[PDB]
Design a protein around this motif. Structure first.
Motif, PDB file in Angstrom:
ATOM      1  N   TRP A 149       0.815  -1.205   0.000  1.00 56.31           N
ATOM      2  CA  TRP A 149       0.000   0.000   0.000  1.00 56.31           C
ATOM      3  C   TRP A 149       0.858   1.268   0.000  1.00 56.31           C
ATOM      4  O   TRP A 149       0.355   2.361  -0.259  1.00 56.31           O
ATOM      5  CB  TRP A 149      -0.981  -0.008   1.175  1.00 56.31           C
ATOM      6  N   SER A 152       0.819   3.089  -3.380  1.00 51.93           N
ATOM      7  CA  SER A 152      -0.235   4.050  -3.687  1.00 51.93           C
ATOM      8  C   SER A 152       0.213   5.485  -3.382  1.00 51.93           C
ATOM      9  O   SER A 152      -0.095   6.406  -4.140  1.00 51.93           O
ATOM     10  CB  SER A 152      -1.536   3.708  -2.948  1.00 51.93           C
ATOM     11  N   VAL A 237      -5.272  -3.456  -5.281  1.00 47.08           N
ATOM     12  CA  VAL A 237      -4.312  -2.381  -5.037  1.00 47.08           C
ATOM     13  C   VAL A 237      -3.805  -1.779  -6.354  1.00 47.08           C
ATOM     14  O   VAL A 237      -3.312  -0.649  -6.376  1.00 47.08           O
ATOM     15  CB  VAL A 237      -3.136  -2.865  -4.186  1.00 47.08           C
TER      16      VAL A 237
END
Length: 389
Positions: A149, A152, A237
């Motif tokens: 993550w 991102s 994701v």
């Protein structure tokens, strides 16, 4: 060979083979290192090899276990080289780079490195040297799922590192400097902005590499249900990262295209719109009894602009108007003969104003195109509904 569009490759020109993620193209020739000619069912052209993913059975799986272990040892050396050669030198050079400039251009890139070493470390443990095709790896992804993550946050600020990279590149000082670091760490003749692009490139590569491992993997394989389990997780994701990246790009190719259109009358397109839905060549009558004009139609969300090709310079387009879809409805006409109006029809439909008695007739050639179109109109309405809502 046969690859798969990882991402859309929108193009302000017709020449460049355009396509959406998933479209499979057939490669004819690959003379260049990073440029190959693609052939599609009806479309044809040249695409960017950087924006596409290449494709007994046990031997195929084993091959899979190896490329994957290799593209990652490759991707990590890139990270090592990026931080060791680029980030470590900039920090030393307090006189050319501020802390602000460093965060902007690099960001948590270092943070992703730490993540990758340990993700690589765990994978190498799972690799089976004896019989490479028994490598049980599916899990390694599944336990490092919360780390991915950080990517991102690297995708959100990537375009800000390019702007600050293009601003510094203008100075000969930063040019020689960036060219000097690249030569020390021993990297290829690719710039800095291109390397900063590899992370945003791998997180996507992950889903395809996995799908490929699932086709040559059998169900009783102790890894099967795990290889299938890792594919799914990542995918989310990767979508969450895109939808941002696909949407953001499609705004530059629009205004870029509008400045190319000759004699442009009216407000800029991005004032009401921000997405293109479908385009083509269709015959149309402005009003009943009117003269048939051959025009190229562009269908946006909220509007549809029409133009006129230069007869000799086919790439030249004159602006001949625009239709507001918010007031117009799409009447699906049936072949045969039209009521005054008063013409004969074959693959035609109609656009009726909501409050007025305004009407416009359209003529496609193929039925494939009247369908694609009528599906294109159903799409621009659900979008305005999905947007306004």
């Amino acid at each position: 060979v046969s690859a798969e569009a990882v991402w859309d490759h929108v193009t302000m020109a017709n020449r460049e083979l355009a396509f959406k993620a998933g479209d499979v193209i057939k490669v004819l020739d690959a003379s260049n290192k990073d440029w190959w000619w693609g052939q599609i069912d009806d479309e044809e052209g040249w695409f960017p090899a950087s924006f596409v993913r290449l494709w007994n059975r046990d031997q195929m799986r084993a091959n899979v276990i190896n490329e994957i272990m290799s593209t990652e040892r490759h991707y990590i050396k890139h990270l090592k080289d990026i931080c060791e050669g680029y980030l470590k030198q900039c920090r030393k050079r307090r006189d050319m780079f501020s802390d602000e400039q460093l965060k902007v251009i690099f960001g948590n890139i270092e943070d992703i490195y730490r993540f990758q070493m340990g993700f690589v470390r765990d994978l190498e443990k799972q690799y089976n040297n004896d019989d490479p095709h028994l490598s049980e790896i599916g899990p390694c992804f599944l336990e490092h799922q919360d780390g991915f993550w950080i990517y991102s946050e690297y995708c959100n600020n990537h375009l800000d590192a390019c702007m600050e990279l293009s601003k510094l590149m203008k100075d000969s000082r930063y040019q020689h400097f960036f060219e000097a670091c690249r030569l020390l760490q021993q990297m290829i003749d690719i710039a800095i902005d291109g390397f900063l692009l590899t992370p945003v490139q791998k997180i996507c590569k992950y889903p395809l590499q996995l799908a490929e491992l699932l086709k040559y993997t059998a169900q009783d394989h102790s890894d099967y249900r795990y290889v299938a389990a890792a594919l799914a997780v990542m995918r989310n994701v990767t979508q969450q990262i895109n939808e941002r990246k696909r949407r953001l790009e499609n705004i530059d190719k629009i205004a870029q295209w509008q400045a190319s259109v000759l004699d442009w009358e009216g407000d800029d397109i991005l004032d009401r719109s921000s997405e293109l839905i479908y385009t083509g060549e269709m015959a149309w009558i402005y009003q009943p009894y009117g003269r048939n004009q051959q025009r190229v139609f562009f269908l946006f969300d909220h509007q549809m602009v029409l133009c006129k090709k230069d007869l000799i310079r086919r790439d030249i387009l004159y602006y001949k108007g625009r239709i507001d879809m918010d007031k117009y409805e799409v009447i699906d006409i049936e072949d045969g003969r039209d009521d005054d109006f008063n013409v004969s029809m074959k693959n035609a439909f109609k656009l009726h104003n909501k409050e007025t008695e305004e009407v416009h007739l359209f003529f496609a050639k193929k039925l494939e195109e009247k369908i694609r179109w009528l599906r294109a109109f159903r799409e621009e309405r659900k979008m305005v509904q999905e947007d306004e809502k």
